[PDB]
Design a protein around this ligand. Structure first.
Ligand SMILES: *[C@@H]1O[C@H](CO)[C@@H](O[C@@H]2O[C@H](CO)[C@@H](O[C@H]3O[C@H](CO)[C@@H](O)[C@H](O)[C@@H]3O)[C@H](O)[C@H]2NC(C)=O)[C@H](O)[C@H]1NC(C)=O
Ligand SMILES: *[C@@H]1O[C@H](CO)[C@@H](O[C@@H]2O[C@H](CO)[C@@H](O[C@H]3O[C@H](CO)[C@@H](O)[C@H](O)[C@@H]3O)[C@H](O)[C@H]2NC(C)=O)[C@H](O)[C@H]1NC(C)=O
Ligand SMILES: *[C@@H]1O[C@H](CO)[C@@H](O[C@@H]2O[C@H](CO)[C@@H](O[C@H]3O[C@H](CO)[C@@H](O)[C@H](O)[C@@H]3O)[C@H](O)[C@H]2NC(C)=O)[C@H](O)[C@H]1NC(C)=O
Ligand SMILES: *[C@@H]1O[C@H](CO)[C@@H](O[C@@H]2O[C@H](CO)[C@@H](O[C@H]3O[C@H](CO)[C@@H](O)[C@H](O)[C@@H]3O)[C@H](O)[C@H]2NC(C)=O)[C@H](O)[C@H]1NC(C)=O
Ligand SMILES: *[C@@H]1O[C@H](CO[C@@H]2O[C@@H](C)[C@@H](O)[C@@H](O)[C@@H]2O)[C@@H](O[C@@H]2O[C@H](CO)[C@@H](O)[C@H](O)[C@H]2NC(C)=O)[C@H](O)[C@H]1NC(C)=O
Ligand SMILES: *[C@@H]1O[C@H](CO[C@@H]2O[C@@H](C)[C@@H](O)[C@@H](O)[C@@H]2O)[C@@H](O[C@@H]2O[C@H](CO)[C@@H](O)[C@H](O)[C@H]2NC(C)=O)[C@H](O)[C@H]1NC(C)=O
Ligand SMILES: *[C@@H]1O[C@H](CO)[C@@H](O)[C@H](O)[C@H]1NC(C)=O
Ligand SMILES: *[C@@H]1O[C@H](CO)[C@@H](O)[C@H](O)[C@H]1NC(C)=O
Ligand SMILES: *[C@@H]1O[C@H](CO)[C@@H](O)[C@H](O)[C@H]1NC(C)=O
Ligand SMILES: *[C@@H]1O[C@H](CO)[C@@H](O)[C@H](O)[C@H]1NC(C)=O
Lengths: 269, 133, 97, 97, 35
């Protein structure tokens, strides 16, 4: 309910966030990865089929996501639970390591290496998103389903449904007021059945879109605003933190996870 | 199940903030919960340091964070102000002081140190007394 | 003195924060607050007699209805399933001890 | 003890038995629906084709076409709803795993 | 009662702190016997 604003200084102890924090040069406060997201996604009226505009505009959604990101990177998890309290980033990350059960001296002994690995990982996902297009199928599919349903609904007006002509003006112009009634009933029944089918499918689709938005809400609350102990919930492996990013008709998370790498055999008691 | 029969660590699940407990209540065709939550209220700015180097070694807090008002250094809980004297039980030693970026100079006290100093003074007094007879 | 106005909605009260690399804020006092939450658990049971509704007390309409197969049986089964599900919901939510 | 208990009573696995039985019952009713007249003079298309001249034969077929199309739509809608609950249980199972 | 326990010594951080004090006390006693 408060829009925290990022500090002008970018001294985070070596960590680099330029690729997730919005860039003022663009007319909209849209980050670079966000721009890749909207570029990948490729987002009737005459028959009464109208489309309405959303209440929350894309700029306001960007304002929300930027406020969330700034609050996280400045204050840890406190801003979701109470009054926001500032804390150094090099201490917040040590708090996360204490959370995952690794003692805090590791950060103070490996800060530069961890920062370099973090930045390299961000660069890797930058490249992966700029390269592959099969990632955004989970959104392109919903767009395609909606377009296909509307297209078939339009196309349905061309069928006879048992009448002598598919055009309401032709039949009304060729037949008098008496026998036209027989042909006009079949058209009404057929088109009414088509509308019923379309509405029912829309009801089911909307229910699933809502179930996904509720899962997304729980993930946001439990991953971004704090640290989650659940296994394989906020990304595979040992969780540290997360970053939300907007996208057309959706949201994209960048889970940051800790994974052990190099083991050795020992003798125990 | 997750709120009434126990305590849930999930953020913003059993009420907004730091959860403590809950109460169910009946209603027509439904249920109503009375979430009871803890929220911090009044904050103050302080000066901090990631580690403390006293005998050429880096000390780190076992529990709490290093805090100072400008003249003396203490450890405090995360969510409530409660200063305490820097002692051995509060800190654990690991590594050297060079790798810690932003380490801050200060002394570190040992609670065993004055207990041993009291016995040393008693022993010195006893030694001095032993020369009297 | 009252009129309909139009304005760009405010996202919220703007609040800048003072980040620094060596300062922390630690709370010294707290409040205990209690907040309510409401969830529906079940809805009213309802059963509709298919043949009664469609052909009230008329033998001719009953006979003409008999041609349409098992639609009435399907509807009765569906509504009975909903009715049982409601009691299942109340049992699950409340009977935990 | 668990092995003995599972080897004793059959009321435990009703959860999976019902998943099988609902599908079997629905498809069985779908098959049964082919025997109804739907207002026609015969339930066998071959007979309506063999009898009557080409024009009227098709008219009776239409009554049959409308009825069978309605039956198919009903079956498909019920399948869509059932699939959603199976997937909701599958998501719960994945989270528990 | 524990299965597979393995023999080894267990060390004390207080033990050398008292051992150094005991050695200092012994040296002080030796010094005190000198005059
Ligand atoms: C944080 O990461 C940023 C993303 O990599 C990085 O910005 C990048 O900076 C380099 C070097 O300044 C730019 O590379 C270009 O730099 C100059 C610009 O005139 C050219 O002469 C070079 O030949 C090269 O083309 C990247 O373009 C730039 N990338 C982006 C997205 O801005 C920051 O420098 C990093 N900051 C810190 C403090 O680590
Ligand atoms: C920062 O916190 C320090 C510890 O809380 C505090 O030092 C303490 O200051 C008080 C005085 O306010 C001292 O109390 C003693 O003061 C006089 C000194 O002669 C005595 O006569 C009194 O009876 C009383 O014992 C504490 O002894 C002292 N403690 C320590 C460890 O130094 C600082 O004053 C605080 N500074 C700021 C700027 O807040
Ligand atoms: C906190 O106490 C530390 C312990 O003394 C102190 O470290 C000391 O720092 C000085 C200043 O550099 C060193 O003095 C040496 O400096 C250079 C080495 O780069 C030499 O050329 C000089 O001749 C001189 O020998 C001390 O050696 C060093 N002491 C130890 C034990 O390492 C910190 O500086 C203190 N904290 C602050 C903020 O000053
Ligand atoms: C680690 O140290 C243990 C402590 O000494 C030691 O236990 C000792 O084991 C020997 C071997 O059995 C015992 O010796 C006695 O064994 C039987 C008793 O069952 C008698 O018939 C023998 O004549 C002999 O007296 C010691 O008594 C026993 N020590 C104690 C204090 O009970 C372990 O064996 C050591 N670990 C390993 C791997 O050897
Ligand atoms: C850890 O050791 C296993 C094998 O156990 C070893 O057994 C002895 C040889 C001795 O060295 C013990 O201390 C060891 O614990 C390794 O598993 C083997 O790996 C090799 C390939 O590296 C493979 O050919 C073998 O088939 C593996 N063993 C089996 C039983 O399949 C394992 O690689 C060691 N871990 C590391 C990190 O080196
Ligand atoms: C905690 O500090 C912030 C800002 O830091 C302060 O900066 C100097 C003025 C100096 O006093 C430092 O020791 C402080 O830490 C305070 O936020 C400011 O609040 C005042 C009014 O309360 C407001 O006019 C300023 O604009 C605020 N600063 C910014 C950057 O917006 C904050 O109030 C301090 N907390 C407490 C409890 O006093
Ligand atoms: C904090 O940043 C200032 C510059 O803004 C720098 O001079 C100082 O060394 C930094 N301190 C730490 C502990 O990083
Ligand atoms: C010194 O030792 C004697 C015993 O030898 C004892 O009686 C006396 O109280 C001691 N004096 C002090 C000051 O401890
Ligand atoms: C481990 O197994 C070996 C045999 O494979 C046995 O000799 C030994 O006692 C066992 N040790 C423990 C601690 O179980
Ligand atoms: C022994 O005691 C005397 C006290 O007269 C002191 O001057 C001297 O330094 C002591 N020697 C040692 C080695 O402690």
């Amino acid at each position: 309910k408060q829009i925290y604003k990022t500090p002008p200084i970018k001294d985070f102890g070596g960590f680099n966030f330029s690729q997730i924090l919005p860039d003022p040069s663009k007319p909209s406060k849209r980050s670079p990865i966000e721009d890749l997201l909207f570029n990948k996604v490729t987002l009737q009226k005459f028959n009464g089929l109208t489309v309405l505009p959303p209440l929350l505009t894309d700029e306001m959604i960007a304002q929300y996501t930027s406020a969330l990101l700034a609050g996280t990177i400045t204050s840890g998890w406190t801003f979701g639970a109470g009054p926001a309290l500032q804390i150094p980033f090099p201490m917040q990350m040590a708090y996360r390591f204490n959370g995952i059960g690794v003692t805090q001296n590791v950060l103070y002994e490996n800060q530069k290496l961890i920062a370099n690995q973090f930045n390299s990982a961000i660069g890797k996902i930058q490249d992966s998103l700029s390269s592959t297009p099969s990632a955004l199928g989970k959104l392109q599919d919903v767009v395609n389903q909606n377009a296909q349903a509307l297209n078939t609904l339009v196309k349905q007006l061309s069928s006879n449904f048992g009448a002598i002509s598919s055009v309401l003006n032709d039949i009304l112009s060729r037949l008098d007021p008496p026998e036209a009634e027989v042909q006009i009933d079949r058209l009404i029944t057929g088109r009414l059945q088509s509308l019923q089918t379309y509405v029912t499918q829309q009801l089911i689709r909307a229910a699933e879109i809502r179930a996904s938005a509720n899962l997304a809400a729980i993930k946001m609350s439990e991953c971004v605003l704090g640290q989650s102990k659940r296994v394989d919930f906020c990304g595979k492996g040992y969780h540290l933190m997360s970053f939300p990013q907007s996208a057309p008709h959706g949201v994209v998370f960048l889970h940051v996870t800790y994974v052990p790498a190099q083991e050795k055999n020992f003798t125990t008691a | 199940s997750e709120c009434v029969l126990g305590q849930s660590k999930r953020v913003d699940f059993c009420g907004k903030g730091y959860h403590l407990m809950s109460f169910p209540q009946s209603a027509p065709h439904g249920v109503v919960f009375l979430h009871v939550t803890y929220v911090p209220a009044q904050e103050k700015n302080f000066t901090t340091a990631p580690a403390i180097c006293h005998d050429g070694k880096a000390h780190f807090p076992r529990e709490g964070v290093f805090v100072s008002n400008g003249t003396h250094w203490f450890v405090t809980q995360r969510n409530f102000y409660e200063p305490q004297i820097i002692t051995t039980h509060n800190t654990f030693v690991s590594g050297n002081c060079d790798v810690v970026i932003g380490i801050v100079n200060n002394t570190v006290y040992d609670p065993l140190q004055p207990e041993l100093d009291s016995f040393k003074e008693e022993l010195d007094k006893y030694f001095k007394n032993h020369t009297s007879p | 003195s009252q009129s309909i106005i139009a304005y760009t909605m405010s996202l919220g009260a703007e609040n800048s924060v003072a980040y620094s690399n060596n300062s922390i804020a630690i709370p010294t006092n707290f409040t205990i607050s209690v907040t309510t939450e409401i969830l529906p658990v079940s809805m009213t049971k309802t059963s509709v007699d298919c043949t009664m509704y469609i052909c009230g007390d008329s033998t001719e309409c009953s006979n003409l209805l008999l041609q349409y197969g098992s639609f009435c049986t399907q509807l009765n089964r569906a509504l009975t399933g909903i009715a049982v599900e409601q009691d299942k919901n109340t049992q699950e939510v409340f009977a935990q001890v």
